[PDB]
Design a protein around this ligand. Structure first.
Ligand SMILES: N[C@@H](Cc1c[nH]c[nH+]1)C(=O)O
Ligand SMILES: N[C@@H](Cc1c[nH]c[nH+]1)C(=O)O
Ligand SMILES: N[C@@H](Cc1c[nH]c[nH+]1)C(=O)O
Ligand SMILES: N[C@@H](Cc1c[nH]c[nH+]1)C(=O)O
Ligand SMILES: N[C@@H](Cc1c[nH]c[nH+]1)C(=O)O
Ligand SMILES: N[C@@H](Cc1c[nH]c[nH+]1)C(=O)O
Lengths: 284, 284, 284, 284, 284, 284
């Protein structure tokens, strides 16, 4: 029996449930209750505060959690990052009032407000800089106008929050917010290593599969050699005859980020009815 | 022209609309209005109170409805259950205050509160027991604390509601809450038998299809004989050559509940890029 | 870099985002902010008032928009309609109090209330009729009861709004509400013609693909000649052997509106496990 | 310790909480939980389904409830109606399809759908009429179109629901929906009679007070005799001098429904600064 | 029977209903339906789009409406403004991109976007300036960035919307957004003049009363002469004895905006228990 | 110009805005924006995270804030508590799994989870006990079941959260959650001492006034001496004649918690029309 911690609210909650569903786990019956028991898969899911998930995995009984990479950097927990999940990512920056040409060295002896004080204190220490780091519970950007701090450190999205308070980011970026699957450190006893390996392989199938599309298309046999070079697939393309003997159908996996260039090339050699379909799971 | 009753709210409403959409019927334009006319399929959908749907099919002009099996047991309507739809199921139990070792025979002459009084009265009669059954409109669990009844009878999910009121279930379970497609009894006149048969076949295609996944995978020809035994499919697996002549691609339907064991076996004989896809409709 | 205007609310908003997602564009991160930048596709999406989108494309810097055909008729903008998108369509009618046998000629010299005054004034002019057209901001049906107008002109859905105010539609219908992709008129400079052509081809792939389903089915070889005539596909059906040598699997695109007749015919010649799957993109 | 049942949702819920607050009882801390304990007043409030409240008072341990008068007529409970609360009232009527001149005698042997079957069966019996009364859970108006019943019986507001289904009300009205304070029948033991009397007196203070306004106004002494006749108050008006010796200020309770006529009369005899204030509690 | 138009949504809707309630009219039973009939006061209220209310009063059968003063300036309707209601007010300004020193004369021949084109065209004409005014449906501030206009004209609150798009207001302000009670022009026939006068007097009682508070306080008789000068009231203060013969209680209306200075002065001459209460209606 | 911090969400937010409104400050225009400027009172209100308000007052530029007393204990800020506001109060307790007879001394060397780690660490130190205090972001009760802690420390309301996780509170209570007005420590410069004193006096007027009701009642002169003893008021009751010379009207402040006993006594000596009204502000 495995126990898995899932974010109960915020930007990571829906895509976390989505990826767990595509790996074949029971979806949350209703957003009101806070556990979901999966008897067929032998897993129980707990919906918890995002900022706490790393502590639950690292000091508690949870085998796995899904949380942001910055929240693991801030927690001080000793957990293993098994997979980057491909969503939720965003930079983490120092920021200060526009129009003063701030640089990292200006932070020495200043007051820096953040919701991630342990992350920031370790970053400054590595750079050899001492400052006064002030923990706040949320929305730190207004703390400069209101006199609590000289600079801040926070997740930045597209900079909307910074510009709305006349702040400019500076310095080298910190530990980012990408969603990760974390695992409790420790070997335990074989029979539990196996159940843990199974969950990781299943989530990995979604993480990998979601990077590709399946292309299906009709192709003249005369253009078949060129098509094979254009879509080599993961092993080699599938080739099947059509009723018309001068034609075949070709099936091949292609990366999402390559798809439109690939289709233009296929169209130019005579390919017709070029179909593209979502992949949600693939065990390579 | 067929008329079909659909639950307008509650746990059965979204999965009911989902299954009707996958059978190819027009989805509800907006959740505010209460009918949806499907001119191409020649069907009209009415969104009604769940507890009333069985009466509308059994005494009204509706040809079909989707409701819970317990609501058909409680209604006294004479309708045909054509299909179990595979969602919404839950046990229906007697329950009484924890710590008293209640058994079914203790109900004789007691006061039993329930939202399904006809269901309960028929269950007790079959067992030869007489008691006083008290109809309530909803949420019956609090009626024991408040002195209206000695025991209750209600749908139980995972027992959250019972434990939150210090109640323990006992006795043989009653008619459960699984969602069913019900049909009005009666033969009418041939031309309407045909239209009715068509809807049932279409919903049955979703009910059946949703129990499987399509597996696609690349396979060495040397492992082909073993693969065929591992995934026999519904008739026999599809086999197509890859460009590489030592390899093929195999397609086969497999039951959802079998999928992960099947993939482990395929991986161990040399299969690569094992893909798994949702099935939403299959006419066997 | 392309700029595309998307309806920010109303009946057209979700299906507009849906079609853009299926063409492979970044979906709106959250419904609160009003732009979405797509760096990989080199497109920026702006979420605007539906009634304004035609003016933004026709007089502004936007390259494309998605809006209703009636809103283009009302705007007076000079834009190109590139594609009908297949949703949101509804008739646009004159309407007047029930029980008076209104005809189009009765409008001469009357007061007509509408949210689309330029559309209505051009329609009347073409028919040679002069009347007083009164602009209102919304919900015009009540304006007759309240004495502001003698008749109205409005989008009609299924006539719910008309019957709820005792109004009956009459006359030839006007410019309808179907969703369209519009483009700014003008040739600019080659390098921008190409980027524009790419977006249109991608949306066209969704518009075309969404009219079909992929049929997959197992078929006895003895029935193969008949099956080929029943499902000719877009080019010709794919044919692949099963393990069992007396059988094959057939793949073919078929129109959504044909699917159930097609399956009945296939069942009657011996086809088994007839599968039907959504198509979301097809470049013919 | 008293236990009081309060409607947990619907049209009666907010005005019920409002009247209990004005009688000085602790207001519901948050709409999520379902009890509120009032330690200073020695009362506990339970928020329950409206249709069940009469059964909880009549067969349970609750001392009081607030519910509709029709729900008491339908419940069959033996409870005392202590006060009409002055909100929620509405007529209860038979109704049938427009354009057929239905009368009460046409109901004999017909099918009548209603959410209040016991109320309707007793009403028909008193009139000497036999019919088939069909219990439904809610929204009964559509049951005629859908073939379940020939006529209905339901609360009517302003007839919106009737006209929206082409129904016309007929016959003598039934037990109406006005909100009432009900009490469990029975004398118990003196010390509990006293606590019960206290709650009734406190709610009665709100019921009575809410029918009046306090008028305050400045008045010339020369017009004082006429003013006294215009506002006699509940006992006799309060009269106090102003600094200016030719003037006084007058205070008097007047009925809400009389207020504007009263003010016109006072203005015409020389009264100035006529103030009118809400009364929320008055023990006569 | 009077008909009154009330804003159905937006910033003016709740305070409009609030002021009508304090004048003693029936409050909207539920926000879903769109009329409210007041049988005791002989008035019917219609909840309409704010931008349309002036047209309904000026060309329709409505006797009164509540809307913004700018919406009357934009409508071109011939209505009487009877009262300023004391809420909803905000300036209406031209605005253009920051950092260019725009002045009113720079508008000549430019493109100006606004939701109030008739208001703007009349303002420019009075100043002798010709420009191209572009009607938009809402949120006009983004139209400059997007190339549709050179400048805008819009209601400004505290400038949040302007600064969020880098716009600066300039020039003389236009017709503002303060809420007003408007009346249809025309004398009709005596018996309807009277009913109209009554509504205006009742709303005026709220408009006037809401500018004051009632002060009540205990005062030594030795300080009575000074107190009388500090709170003269609307006519002269009320003076009543306390049980203690060296003391009195004083009652007087004072303006809300004066209240705190007044209390400081009273405290400094020996006044105790200085009470201050809301006034919701006063007929002077 | 004063700056005041107000809770932006949670149980303290609405009653905080309510008390500020009754002291005569501008109410939040809309819950979306996060500042409100009051030009007439010369105060600006900032709506912030509750857990941060003490830090904003203690280290920032804010003059005042409203927050929970426990949040001040947890913050470590050096602020002055000027007033207890009379809402939001609740006990703060250690808690551990039911059925083990936990006492305070059992905490030595254990793991204690809490959202208020500084509060807990100072409480344990004062008692001479060392333990490991684990910071969590919220909802700490589940941390025992999930293995992160042996005991917790949290605000308890009525114990719903404790019993829902099988926890029992024990030990002496900690710093409670009552809402307080806090002020920045420091004298600054006279002209700002005065503006600060004014706000405190105004909030104090609400805090004091809200503990009383105004009683108004008609009284026979023969019972006047007894009535004066029953309602002495804050100074002495107001006495004014009625028109009827055998009667008077009496006005007196009485404590809310005394009101019903007081009215029973007045009724028994002949008092009639006993009226009771809310007090929202009183400067003693
Ligand atoms: N043979 C193709 C398609 C495929 C992958 N898996 C199964 N089929 C490829 O290797 O990409
Ligand atoms: N031939 C495989 C896959 C398939 C089913 N239907 C069409 N193809 C099977 O029978 O399972
Ligand atoms: N060969 C089939 C199926 C197919 C289309 N595209 C790829 N395969 C057809 O032409 O319809
Ligand atoms: N004396 C007035 C006002 C009043 C009632 N109660 C107290 N004062 C009346 O009897 O109506
Ligand atoms: N006499 C005081 C209070 C009052 C007004 N109206 C009635 N009483 C004044 O004139 O202001
Ligand atoms: N004189 C009464 C009522 C009152 C207070 N303030 C003004 N009037 C009292 O002192 O309680």
């Amino acid at each position: 029996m495995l126990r898995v911690a899932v974010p109960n609210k915020g930007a990571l909650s829906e895509p976390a449930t989505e990826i767990l569903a595509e790996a074949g786990y029971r979806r949350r019956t209703d957003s009101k209750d806070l556990t979901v028991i999966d008897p067929v898969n032998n897993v129980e899911f707990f919906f918890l505060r995002p900022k706490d998930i790393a502590i639950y995995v690292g000091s508690g009984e949870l085998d796995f959690g899904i949380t942001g990479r910055d929240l693991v950097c801030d927690s001080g927990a000793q957990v293993r990052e098994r997979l980057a999940l491909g969503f939720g990512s965003s930079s983490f920056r120092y920021a200060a009032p526009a129009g003063r040409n701030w640089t990292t060295a200006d932070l020495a002896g200043m007051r820096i407000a953040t919701a991630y004080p342990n992350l920031v204190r370790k970053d400054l220490a590595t750079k050899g800089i001492e400052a006064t780091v002030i923990r706040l519970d949320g929305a730190v950007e207004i703390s400069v106008q209101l006199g609590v701090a000289d600079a801040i450190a926070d997740v930045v999205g597209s900079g909307r929050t910074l510009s709305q308070h006349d702040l400019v980011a500076f310095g080298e970026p910190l530990c980012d917010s990408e969603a990760v699957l974390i695992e409790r450190a420790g070997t335990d006893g074989q029979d539990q290593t196996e159940a843990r390996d199974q969950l990781v392989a299943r989530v990995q199938g979604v993480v990998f599969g979601q990077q590709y599309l399946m292309l299906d298309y009709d192709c003249p046999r005369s253009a078949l050699k060129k098509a094979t070079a254009i879509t080599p697939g993961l092993e080699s393309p599938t080739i099947a005859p059509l009723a018309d003997p001068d034609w075949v159908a070709i099936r091949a996996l292609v990366p999402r980020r390559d798809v439109n260039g690939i289709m233009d090339e296929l169209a130019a050699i005579g390919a017709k009815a070029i179909l593209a379909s979502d992949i949600r799971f693939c065990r390579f």
